[PDB]
Coordinates of N, CA, C and O (backbone and C1' of nucleotides) in Angstrom, one line a residue:
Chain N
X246 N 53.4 138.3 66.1 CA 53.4 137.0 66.8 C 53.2 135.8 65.8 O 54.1 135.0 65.6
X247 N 52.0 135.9 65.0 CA 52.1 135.3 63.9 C 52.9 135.0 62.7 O 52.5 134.1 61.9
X248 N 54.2 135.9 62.6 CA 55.4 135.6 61.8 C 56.2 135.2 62.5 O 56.6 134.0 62.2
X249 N 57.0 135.8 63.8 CA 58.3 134.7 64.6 C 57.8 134.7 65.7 O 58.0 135.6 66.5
X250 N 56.7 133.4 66.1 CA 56.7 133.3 67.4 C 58.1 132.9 68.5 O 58.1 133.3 69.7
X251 N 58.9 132.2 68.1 CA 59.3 131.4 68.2 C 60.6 132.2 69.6 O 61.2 133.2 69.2
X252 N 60.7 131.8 70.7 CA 60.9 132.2 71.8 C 63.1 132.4 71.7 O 63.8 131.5 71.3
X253 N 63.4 133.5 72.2 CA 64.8 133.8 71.9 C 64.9 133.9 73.4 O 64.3 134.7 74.1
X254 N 65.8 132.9 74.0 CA 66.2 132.9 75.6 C 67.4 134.0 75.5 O 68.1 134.1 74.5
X255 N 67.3 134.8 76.7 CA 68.1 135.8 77.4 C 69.3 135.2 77.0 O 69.4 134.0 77.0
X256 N 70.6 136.3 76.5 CA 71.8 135.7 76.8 C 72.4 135.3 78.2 O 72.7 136.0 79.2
X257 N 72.6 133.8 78.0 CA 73.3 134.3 80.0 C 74.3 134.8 80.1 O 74.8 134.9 79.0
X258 N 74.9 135.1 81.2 CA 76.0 136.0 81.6 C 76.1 135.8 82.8 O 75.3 136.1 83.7
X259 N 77.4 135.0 82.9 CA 77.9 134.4 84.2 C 78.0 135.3 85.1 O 77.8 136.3 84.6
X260 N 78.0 135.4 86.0 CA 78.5 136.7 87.3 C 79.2 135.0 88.5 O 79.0 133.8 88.7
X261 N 80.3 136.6 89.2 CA 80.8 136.0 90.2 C 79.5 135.5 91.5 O 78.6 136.4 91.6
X262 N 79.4 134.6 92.3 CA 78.5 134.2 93.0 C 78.7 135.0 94.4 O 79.7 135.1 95.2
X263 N 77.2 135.5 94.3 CA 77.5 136.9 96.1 C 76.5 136.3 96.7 O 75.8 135.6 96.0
X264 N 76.3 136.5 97.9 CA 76.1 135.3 99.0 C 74.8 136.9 99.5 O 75.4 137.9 100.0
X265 N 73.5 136.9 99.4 CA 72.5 137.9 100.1 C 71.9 137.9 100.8 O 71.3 139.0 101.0
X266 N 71.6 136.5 101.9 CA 70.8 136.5 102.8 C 71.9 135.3 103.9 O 72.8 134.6 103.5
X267 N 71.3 135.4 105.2 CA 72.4 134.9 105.8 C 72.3 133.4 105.7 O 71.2 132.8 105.6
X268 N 73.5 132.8 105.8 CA 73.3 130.7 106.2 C 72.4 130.6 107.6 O 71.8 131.5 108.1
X269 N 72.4 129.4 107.9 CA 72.2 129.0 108.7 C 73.3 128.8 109.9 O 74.2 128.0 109.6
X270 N 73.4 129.4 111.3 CA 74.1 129.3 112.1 C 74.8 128.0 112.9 O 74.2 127.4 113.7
X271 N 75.5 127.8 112.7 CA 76.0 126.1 113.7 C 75.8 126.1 115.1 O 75.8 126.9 115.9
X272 N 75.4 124.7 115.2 CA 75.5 124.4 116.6 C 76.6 124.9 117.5 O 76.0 125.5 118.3
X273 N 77.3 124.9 117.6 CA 78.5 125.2 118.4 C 78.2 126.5 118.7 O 77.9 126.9 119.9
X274 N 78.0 127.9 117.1 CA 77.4 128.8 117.6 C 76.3 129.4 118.2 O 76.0 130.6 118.5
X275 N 75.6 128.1 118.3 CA 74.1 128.3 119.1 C 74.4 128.3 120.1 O 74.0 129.2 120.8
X276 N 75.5 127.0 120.6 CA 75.8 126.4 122.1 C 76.2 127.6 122.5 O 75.4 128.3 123.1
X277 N 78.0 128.6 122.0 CA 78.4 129.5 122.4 C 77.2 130.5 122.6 O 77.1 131.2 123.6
X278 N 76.7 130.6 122.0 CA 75.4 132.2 122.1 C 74.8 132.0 123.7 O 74.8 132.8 124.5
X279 N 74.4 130.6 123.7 CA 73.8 130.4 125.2 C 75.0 130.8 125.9 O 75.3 131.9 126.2
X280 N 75.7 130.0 126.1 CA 76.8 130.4 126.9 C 77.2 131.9 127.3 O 77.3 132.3 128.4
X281 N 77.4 132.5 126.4 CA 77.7 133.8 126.0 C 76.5 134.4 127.4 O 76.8 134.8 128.5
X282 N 75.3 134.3 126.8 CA 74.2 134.9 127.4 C 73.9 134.5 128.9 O 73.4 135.5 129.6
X283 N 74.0 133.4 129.5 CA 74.4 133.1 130.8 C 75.5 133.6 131.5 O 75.6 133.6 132.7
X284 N 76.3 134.0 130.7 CA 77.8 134.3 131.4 C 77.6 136.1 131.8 O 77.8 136.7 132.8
X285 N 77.2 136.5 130.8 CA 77.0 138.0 130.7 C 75.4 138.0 131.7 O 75.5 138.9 132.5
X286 N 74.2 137.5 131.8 CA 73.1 137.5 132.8 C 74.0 137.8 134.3 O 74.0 138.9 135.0
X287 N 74.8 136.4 134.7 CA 75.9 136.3 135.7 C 76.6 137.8 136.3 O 76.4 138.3 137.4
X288 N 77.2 138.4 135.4 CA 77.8 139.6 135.4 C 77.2 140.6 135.7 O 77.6 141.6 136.4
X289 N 76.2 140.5 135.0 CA 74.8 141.8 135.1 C 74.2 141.7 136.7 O 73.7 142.7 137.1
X290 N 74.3 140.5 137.5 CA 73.5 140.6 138.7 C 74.9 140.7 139.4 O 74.7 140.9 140.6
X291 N 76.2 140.8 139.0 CA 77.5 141.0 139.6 C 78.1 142.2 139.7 O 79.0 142.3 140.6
X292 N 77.8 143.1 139.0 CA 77.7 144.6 138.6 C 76.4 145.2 139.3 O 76.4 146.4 139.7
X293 N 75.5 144.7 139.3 CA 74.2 145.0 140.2 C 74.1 144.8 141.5 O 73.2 145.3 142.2
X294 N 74.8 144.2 141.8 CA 74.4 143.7 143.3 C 76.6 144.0 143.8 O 77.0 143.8 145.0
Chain T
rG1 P 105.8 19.7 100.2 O5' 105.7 20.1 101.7 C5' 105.7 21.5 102.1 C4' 106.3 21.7 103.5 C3' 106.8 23.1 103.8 O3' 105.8 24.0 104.2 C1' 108.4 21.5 104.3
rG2 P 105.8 25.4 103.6 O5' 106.9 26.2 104.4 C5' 106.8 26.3 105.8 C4' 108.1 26.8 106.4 C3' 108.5 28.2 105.9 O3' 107.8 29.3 106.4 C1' 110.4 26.7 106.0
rG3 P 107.6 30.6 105.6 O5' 108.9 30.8 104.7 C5' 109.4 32.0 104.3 C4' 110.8 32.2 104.6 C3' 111.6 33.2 103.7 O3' 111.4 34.6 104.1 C1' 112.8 31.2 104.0
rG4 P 111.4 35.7 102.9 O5' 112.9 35.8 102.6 C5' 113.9 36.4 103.5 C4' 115.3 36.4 102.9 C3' 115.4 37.1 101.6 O3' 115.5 38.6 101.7 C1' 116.5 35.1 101.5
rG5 P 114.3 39.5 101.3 O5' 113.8 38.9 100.0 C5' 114.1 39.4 98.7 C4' 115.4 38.8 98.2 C3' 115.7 39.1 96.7 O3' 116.4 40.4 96.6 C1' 116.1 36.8 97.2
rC6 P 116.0 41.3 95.3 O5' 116.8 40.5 94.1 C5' 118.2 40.3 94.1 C4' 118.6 39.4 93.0 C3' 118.5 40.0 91.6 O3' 119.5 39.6 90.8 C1' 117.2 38.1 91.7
rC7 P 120.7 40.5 90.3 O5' 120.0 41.6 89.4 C5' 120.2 43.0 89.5 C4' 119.6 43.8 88.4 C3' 119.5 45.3 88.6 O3' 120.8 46.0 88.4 C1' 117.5 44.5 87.8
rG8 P 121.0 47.5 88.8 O5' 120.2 48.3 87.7 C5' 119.6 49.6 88.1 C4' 118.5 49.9 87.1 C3' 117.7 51.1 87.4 O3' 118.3 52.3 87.0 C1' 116.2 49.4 86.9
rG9 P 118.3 53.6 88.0 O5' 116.8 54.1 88.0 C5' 116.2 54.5 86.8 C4' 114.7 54.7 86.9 C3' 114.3 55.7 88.0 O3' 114.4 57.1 87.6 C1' 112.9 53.8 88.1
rG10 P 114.9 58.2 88.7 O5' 113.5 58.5 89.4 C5' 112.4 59.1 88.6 C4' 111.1 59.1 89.4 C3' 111.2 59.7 90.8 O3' 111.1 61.1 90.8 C1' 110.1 57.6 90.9
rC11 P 112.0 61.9 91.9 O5' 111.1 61.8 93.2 C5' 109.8 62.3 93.3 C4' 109.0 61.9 94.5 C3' 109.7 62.2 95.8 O3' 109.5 63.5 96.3 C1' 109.1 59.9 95.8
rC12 P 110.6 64.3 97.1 O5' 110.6 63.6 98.6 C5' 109.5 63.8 99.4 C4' 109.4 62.8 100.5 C3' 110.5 62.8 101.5 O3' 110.3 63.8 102.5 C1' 110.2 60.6 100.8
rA13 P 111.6 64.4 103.3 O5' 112.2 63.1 104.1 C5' 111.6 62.6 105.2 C4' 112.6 61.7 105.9 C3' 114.0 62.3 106.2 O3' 114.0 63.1 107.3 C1' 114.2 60.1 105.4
rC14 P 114.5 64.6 107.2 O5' 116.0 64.5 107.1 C5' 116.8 63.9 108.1 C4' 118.3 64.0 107.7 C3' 118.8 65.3 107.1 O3' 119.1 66.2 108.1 C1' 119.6 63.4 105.9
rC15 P 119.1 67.8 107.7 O5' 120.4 68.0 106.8 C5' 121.7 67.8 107.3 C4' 122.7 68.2 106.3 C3' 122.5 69.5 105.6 O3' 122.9 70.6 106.3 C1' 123.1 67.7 104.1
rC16 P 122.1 72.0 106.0 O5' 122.6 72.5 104.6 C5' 124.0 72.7 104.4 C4' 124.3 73.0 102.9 C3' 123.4 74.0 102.2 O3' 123.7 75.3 102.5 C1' 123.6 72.1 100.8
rC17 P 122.5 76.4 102.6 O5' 122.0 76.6 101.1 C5' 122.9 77.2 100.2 C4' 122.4 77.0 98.8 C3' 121.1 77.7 98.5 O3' 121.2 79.1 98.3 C1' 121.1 75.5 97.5
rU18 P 120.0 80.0 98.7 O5' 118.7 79.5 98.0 C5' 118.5 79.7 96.6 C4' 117.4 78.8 96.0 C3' 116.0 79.1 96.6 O3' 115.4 80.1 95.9 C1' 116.4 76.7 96.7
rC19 P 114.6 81.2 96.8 O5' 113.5 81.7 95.7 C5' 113.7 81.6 94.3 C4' 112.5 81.2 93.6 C3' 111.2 81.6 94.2 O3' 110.8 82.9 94.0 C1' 111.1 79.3 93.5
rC20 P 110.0 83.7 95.1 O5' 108.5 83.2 94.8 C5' 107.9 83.3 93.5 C4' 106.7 82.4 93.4 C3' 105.6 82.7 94.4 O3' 104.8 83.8 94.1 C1' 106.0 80.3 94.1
rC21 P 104.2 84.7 95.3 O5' 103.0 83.8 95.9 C5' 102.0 83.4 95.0 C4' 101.1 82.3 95.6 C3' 100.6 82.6 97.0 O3' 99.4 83.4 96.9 C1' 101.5 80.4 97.0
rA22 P 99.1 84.4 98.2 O5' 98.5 83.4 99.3 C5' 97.4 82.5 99.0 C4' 97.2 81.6 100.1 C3' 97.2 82.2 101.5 O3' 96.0 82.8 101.8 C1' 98.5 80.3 101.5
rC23 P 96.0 84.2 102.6 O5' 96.1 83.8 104.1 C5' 95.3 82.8 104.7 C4' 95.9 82.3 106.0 C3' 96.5 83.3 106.9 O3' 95.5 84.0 107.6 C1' 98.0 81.6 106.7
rG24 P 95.7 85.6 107.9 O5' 96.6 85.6 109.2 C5' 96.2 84.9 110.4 C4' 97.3 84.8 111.4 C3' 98.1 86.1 111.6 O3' 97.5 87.0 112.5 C1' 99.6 84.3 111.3
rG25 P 97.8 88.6 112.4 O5' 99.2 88.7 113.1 C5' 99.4 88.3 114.4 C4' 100.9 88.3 114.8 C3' 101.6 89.6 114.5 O3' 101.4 90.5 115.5 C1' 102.9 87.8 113.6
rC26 P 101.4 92.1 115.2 O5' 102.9 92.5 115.0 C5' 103.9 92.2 116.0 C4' 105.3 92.3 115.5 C3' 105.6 93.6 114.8 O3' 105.9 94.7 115.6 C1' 106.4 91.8 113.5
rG27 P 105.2 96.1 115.4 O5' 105.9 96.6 114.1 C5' 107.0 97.5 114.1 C4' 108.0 97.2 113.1 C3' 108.2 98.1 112.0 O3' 109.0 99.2 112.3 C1' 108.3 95.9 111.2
rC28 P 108.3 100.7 112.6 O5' 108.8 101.6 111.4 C5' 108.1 101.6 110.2 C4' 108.9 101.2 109.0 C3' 108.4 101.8 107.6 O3' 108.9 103.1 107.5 C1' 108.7 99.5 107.4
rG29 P 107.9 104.3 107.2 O5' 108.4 104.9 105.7 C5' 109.1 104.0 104.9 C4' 108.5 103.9 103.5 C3' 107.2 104.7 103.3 O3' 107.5 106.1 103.0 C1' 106.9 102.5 102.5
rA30 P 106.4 107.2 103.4 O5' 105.3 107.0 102.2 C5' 105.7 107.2 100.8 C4' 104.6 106.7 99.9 C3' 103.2 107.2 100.1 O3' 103.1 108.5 99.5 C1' 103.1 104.9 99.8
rC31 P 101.7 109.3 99.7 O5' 100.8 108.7 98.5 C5' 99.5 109.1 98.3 C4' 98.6 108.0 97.7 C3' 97.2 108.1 98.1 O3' 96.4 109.0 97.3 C1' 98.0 105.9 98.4
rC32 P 95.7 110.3 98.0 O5' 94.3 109.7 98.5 C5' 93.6 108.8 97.7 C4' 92.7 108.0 98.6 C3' 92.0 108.7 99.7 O3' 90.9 109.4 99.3 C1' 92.9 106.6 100.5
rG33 P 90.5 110.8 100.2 O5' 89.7 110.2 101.4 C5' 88.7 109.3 101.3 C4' 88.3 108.6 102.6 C3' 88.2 109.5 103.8 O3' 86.9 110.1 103.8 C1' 89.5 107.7 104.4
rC34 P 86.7 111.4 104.7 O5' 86.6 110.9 106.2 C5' 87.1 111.6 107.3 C4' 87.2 110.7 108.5 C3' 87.6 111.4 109.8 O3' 86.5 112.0 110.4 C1' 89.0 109.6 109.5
rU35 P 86.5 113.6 110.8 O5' 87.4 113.7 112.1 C5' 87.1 112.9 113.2 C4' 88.3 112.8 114.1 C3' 88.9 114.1 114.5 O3' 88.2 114.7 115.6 C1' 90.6 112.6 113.9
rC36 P 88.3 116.3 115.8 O5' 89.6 116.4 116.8 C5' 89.7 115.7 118.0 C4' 91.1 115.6 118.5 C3' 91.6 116.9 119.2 O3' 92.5 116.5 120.3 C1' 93.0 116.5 117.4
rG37 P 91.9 122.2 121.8 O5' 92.5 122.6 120.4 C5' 93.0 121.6 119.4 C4' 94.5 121.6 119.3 C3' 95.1 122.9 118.7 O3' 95.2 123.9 119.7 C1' 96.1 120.9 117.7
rG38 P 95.2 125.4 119.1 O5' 96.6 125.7 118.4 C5' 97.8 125.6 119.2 C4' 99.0 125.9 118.3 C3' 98.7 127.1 117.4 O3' 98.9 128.4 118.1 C1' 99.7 125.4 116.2
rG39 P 97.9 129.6 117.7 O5' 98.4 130.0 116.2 C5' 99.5 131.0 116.0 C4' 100.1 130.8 114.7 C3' 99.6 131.6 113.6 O3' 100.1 132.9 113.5 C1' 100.0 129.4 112.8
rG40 P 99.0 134.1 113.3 O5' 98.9 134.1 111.7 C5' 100.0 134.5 110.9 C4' 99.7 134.3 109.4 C3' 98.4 135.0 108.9 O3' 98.6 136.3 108.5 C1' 98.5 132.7 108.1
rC41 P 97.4 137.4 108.9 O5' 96.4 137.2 107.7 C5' 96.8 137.5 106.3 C4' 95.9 136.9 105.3 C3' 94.4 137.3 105.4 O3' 94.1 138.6 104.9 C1' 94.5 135.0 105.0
rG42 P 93.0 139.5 105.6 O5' 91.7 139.0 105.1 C5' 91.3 139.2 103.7 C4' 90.3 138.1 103.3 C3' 88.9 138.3 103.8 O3' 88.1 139.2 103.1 C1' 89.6 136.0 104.0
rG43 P 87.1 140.2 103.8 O5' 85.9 139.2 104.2 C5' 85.0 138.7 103.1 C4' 84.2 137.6 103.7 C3' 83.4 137.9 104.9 O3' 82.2 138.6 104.6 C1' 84.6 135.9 105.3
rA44 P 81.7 139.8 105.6 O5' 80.6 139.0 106.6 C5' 79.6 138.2 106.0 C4' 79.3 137.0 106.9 C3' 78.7 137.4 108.3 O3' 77.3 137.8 108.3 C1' 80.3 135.7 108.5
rC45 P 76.9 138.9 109.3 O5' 76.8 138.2 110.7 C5' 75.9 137.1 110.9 C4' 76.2 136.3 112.1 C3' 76.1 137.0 113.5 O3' 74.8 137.0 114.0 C1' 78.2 135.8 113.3
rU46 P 74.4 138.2 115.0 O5' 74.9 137.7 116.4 C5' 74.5 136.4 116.9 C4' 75.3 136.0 118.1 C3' 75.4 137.0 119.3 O3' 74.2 137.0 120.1 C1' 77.6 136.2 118.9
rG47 P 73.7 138.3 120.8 O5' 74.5 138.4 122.1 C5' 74.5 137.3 123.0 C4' 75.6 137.5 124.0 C3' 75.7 138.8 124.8 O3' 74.9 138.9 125.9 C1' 77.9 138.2 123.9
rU48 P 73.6 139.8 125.8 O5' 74.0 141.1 126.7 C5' 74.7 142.2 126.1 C4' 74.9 143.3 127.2 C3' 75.7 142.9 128.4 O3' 77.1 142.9 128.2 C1' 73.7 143.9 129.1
rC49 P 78.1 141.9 128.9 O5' 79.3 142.8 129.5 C5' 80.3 143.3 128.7 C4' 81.4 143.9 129.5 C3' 82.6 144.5 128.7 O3' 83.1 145.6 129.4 C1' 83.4 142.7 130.0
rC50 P 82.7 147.1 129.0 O5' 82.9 147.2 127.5 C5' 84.2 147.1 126.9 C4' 84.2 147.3 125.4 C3' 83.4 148.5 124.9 O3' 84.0 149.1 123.8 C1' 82.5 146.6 124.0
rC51 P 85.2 150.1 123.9 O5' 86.5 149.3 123.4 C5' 86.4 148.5 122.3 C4' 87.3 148.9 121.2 C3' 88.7 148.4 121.3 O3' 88.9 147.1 120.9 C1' 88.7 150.7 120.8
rC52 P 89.8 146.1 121.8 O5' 89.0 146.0 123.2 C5' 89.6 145.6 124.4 C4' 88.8 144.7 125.2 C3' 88.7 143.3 124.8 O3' 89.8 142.5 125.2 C1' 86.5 144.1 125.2
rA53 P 90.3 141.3 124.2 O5' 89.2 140.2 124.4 C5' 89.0 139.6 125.7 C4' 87.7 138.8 125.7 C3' 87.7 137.6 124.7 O3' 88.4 136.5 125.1 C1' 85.6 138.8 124.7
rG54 P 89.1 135.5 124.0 O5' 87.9 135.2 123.0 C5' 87.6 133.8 122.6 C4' 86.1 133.6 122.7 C3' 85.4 132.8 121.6 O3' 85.4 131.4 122.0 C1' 84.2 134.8 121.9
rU55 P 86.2 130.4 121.1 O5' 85.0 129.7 120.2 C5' 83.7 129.7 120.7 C4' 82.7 129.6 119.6 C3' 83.3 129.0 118.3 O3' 83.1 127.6 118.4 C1' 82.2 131.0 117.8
rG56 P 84.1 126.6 117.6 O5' 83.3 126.1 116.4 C5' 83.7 126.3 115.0 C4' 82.5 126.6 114.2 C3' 82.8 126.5 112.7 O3' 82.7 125.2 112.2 C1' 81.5 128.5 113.1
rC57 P 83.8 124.6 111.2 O5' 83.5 125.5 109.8 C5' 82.3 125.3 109.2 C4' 82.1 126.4 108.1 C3' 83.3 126.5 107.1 O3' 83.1 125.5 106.1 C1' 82.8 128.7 107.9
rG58 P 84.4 124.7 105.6 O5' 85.0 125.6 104.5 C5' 84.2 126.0 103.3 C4' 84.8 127.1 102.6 C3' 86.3 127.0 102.3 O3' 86.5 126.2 101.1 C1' 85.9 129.1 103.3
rC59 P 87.6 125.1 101.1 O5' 89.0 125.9 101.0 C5' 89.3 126.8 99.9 C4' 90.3 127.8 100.3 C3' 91.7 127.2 100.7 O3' 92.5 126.8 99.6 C1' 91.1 128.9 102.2
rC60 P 93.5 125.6 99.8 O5' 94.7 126.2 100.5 C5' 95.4 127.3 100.0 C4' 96.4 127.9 101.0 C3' 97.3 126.9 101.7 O3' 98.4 126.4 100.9 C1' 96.4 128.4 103.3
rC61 P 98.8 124.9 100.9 O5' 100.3 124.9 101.4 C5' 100.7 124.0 102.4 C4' 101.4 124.7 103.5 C3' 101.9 123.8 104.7 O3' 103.1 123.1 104.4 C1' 100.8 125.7 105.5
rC62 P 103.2 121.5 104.6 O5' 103.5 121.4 106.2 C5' 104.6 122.1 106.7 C4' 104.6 122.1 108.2 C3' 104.3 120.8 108.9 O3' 105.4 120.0 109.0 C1' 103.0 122.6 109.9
rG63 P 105.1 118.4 109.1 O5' 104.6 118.1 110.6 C5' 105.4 118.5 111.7 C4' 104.6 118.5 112.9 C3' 104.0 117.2 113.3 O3' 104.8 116.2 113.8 C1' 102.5 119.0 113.7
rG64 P 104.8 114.7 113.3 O5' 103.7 114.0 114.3 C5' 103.9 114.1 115.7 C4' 102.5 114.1 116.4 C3' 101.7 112.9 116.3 O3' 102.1 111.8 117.1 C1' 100.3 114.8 116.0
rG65 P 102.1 110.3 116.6 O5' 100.6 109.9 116.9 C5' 100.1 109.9 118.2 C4' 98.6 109.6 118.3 C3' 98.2 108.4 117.5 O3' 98.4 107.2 118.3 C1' 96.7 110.2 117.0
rC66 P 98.6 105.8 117.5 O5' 97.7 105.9 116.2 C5' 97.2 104.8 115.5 C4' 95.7 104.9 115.3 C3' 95.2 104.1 114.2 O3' 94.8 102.8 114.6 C1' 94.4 106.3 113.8
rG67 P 94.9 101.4 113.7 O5' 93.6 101.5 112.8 C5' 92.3 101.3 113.4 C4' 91.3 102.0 112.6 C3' 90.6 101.2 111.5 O3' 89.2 101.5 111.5 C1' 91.6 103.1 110.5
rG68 P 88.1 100.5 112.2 O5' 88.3 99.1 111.5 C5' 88.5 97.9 112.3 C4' 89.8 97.3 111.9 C3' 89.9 96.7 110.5 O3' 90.9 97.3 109.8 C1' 90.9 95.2 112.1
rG69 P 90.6 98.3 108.5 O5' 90.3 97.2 107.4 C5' 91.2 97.1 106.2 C4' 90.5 97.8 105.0 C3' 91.3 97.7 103.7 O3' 91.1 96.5 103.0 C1' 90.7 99.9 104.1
rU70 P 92.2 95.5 102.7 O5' 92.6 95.7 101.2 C5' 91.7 96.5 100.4 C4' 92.6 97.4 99.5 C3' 94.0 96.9 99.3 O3' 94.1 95.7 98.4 C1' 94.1 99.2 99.7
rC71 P 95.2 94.6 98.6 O5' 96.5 95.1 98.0 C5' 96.5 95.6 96.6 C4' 97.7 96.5 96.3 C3' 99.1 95.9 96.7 O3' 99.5 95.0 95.7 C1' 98.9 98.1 97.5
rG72 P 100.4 93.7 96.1 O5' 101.9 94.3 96.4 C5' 102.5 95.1 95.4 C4' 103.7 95.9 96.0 C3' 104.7 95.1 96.8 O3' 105.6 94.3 96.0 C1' 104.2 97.1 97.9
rC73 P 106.2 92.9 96.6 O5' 107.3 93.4 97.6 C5' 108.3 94.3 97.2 C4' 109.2 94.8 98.4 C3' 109.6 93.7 99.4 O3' 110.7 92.9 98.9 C1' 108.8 95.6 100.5
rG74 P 110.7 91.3 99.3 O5' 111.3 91.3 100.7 C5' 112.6 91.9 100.9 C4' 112.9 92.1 102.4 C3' 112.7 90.9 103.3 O3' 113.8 90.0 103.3 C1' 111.6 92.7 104.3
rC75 P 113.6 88.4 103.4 O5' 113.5 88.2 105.0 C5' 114.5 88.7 105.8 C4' 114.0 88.7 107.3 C3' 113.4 87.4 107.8 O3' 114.3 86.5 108.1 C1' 112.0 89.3 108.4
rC76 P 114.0 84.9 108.0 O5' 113.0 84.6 109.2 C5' 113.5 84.9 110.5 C4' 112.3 84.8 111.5 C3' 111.5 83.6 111.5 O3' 112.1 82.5 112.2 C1' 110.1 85.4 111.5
rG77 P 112.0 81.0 111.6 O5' 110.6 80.5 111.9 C5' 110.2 80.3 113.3 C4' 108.7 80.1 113.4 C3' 108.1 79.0 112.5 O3' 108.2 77.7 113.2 C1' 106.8 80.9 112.3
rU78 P 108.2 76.4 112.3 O5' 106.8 76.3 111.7 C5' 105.7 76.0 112.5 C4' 104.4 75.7 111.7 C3' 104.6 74.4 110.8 O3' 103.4 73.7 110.8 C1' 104.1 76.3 109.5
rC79 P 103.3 72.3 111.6 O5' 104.0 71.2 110.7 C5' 105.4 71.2 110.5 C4' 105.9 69.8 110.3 C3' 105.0 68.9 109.5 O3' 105.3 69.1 108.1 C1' 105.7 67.7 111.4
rG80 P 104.1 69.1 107.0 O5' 103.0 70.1 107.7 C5' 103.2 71.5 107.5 C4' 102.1 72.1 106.7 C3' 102.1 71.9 105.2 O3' 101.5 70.6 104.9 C1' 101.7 74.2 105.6

RNA sequence: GGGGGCCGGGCCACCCCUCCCACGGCGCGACCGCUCGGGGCGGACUGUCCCCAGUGCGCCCCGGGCGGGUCGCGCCGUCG
């Protein structure tokens, strides 16, 4: 330590950019999700009844 | 006493040609910024129609509606 402290950073190494956890969803597909889910409740008491 | 005046010049009045700028309108042309649809590819996600049905996103072409943006071009109007 006392002869080369002196700090040697990692070589970087570019990599292609991969995507690991999910975004954030849009409105539209929030709106559709409700929708979706009302439509199919509908059906479920329509097949039931 | 009352008048006309005395020679050139410049500008305007009229005719023809006619440059620039400003302002308004009308059209076009191209940038730039918005917007609603058609297709192609990838990628993610959703729904108790599930070998079913959707919804964003990235990317790729085509079409359409605009901005009281910007520039350029032409025409019209101004006792400019």
């Amino acid at each position: 330590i006392r002869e080369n402290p002196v700090y040697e950073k990692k070589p970087k190494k570019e990599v292609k950019k991969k995507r690991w956890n999910r975004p954030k969803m849009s409105l539209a597909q929030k709106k559709d999700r409700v929708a979706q889910k009302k439509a199919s409740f509908l059906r479920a008491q329509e097949r039931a009844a």
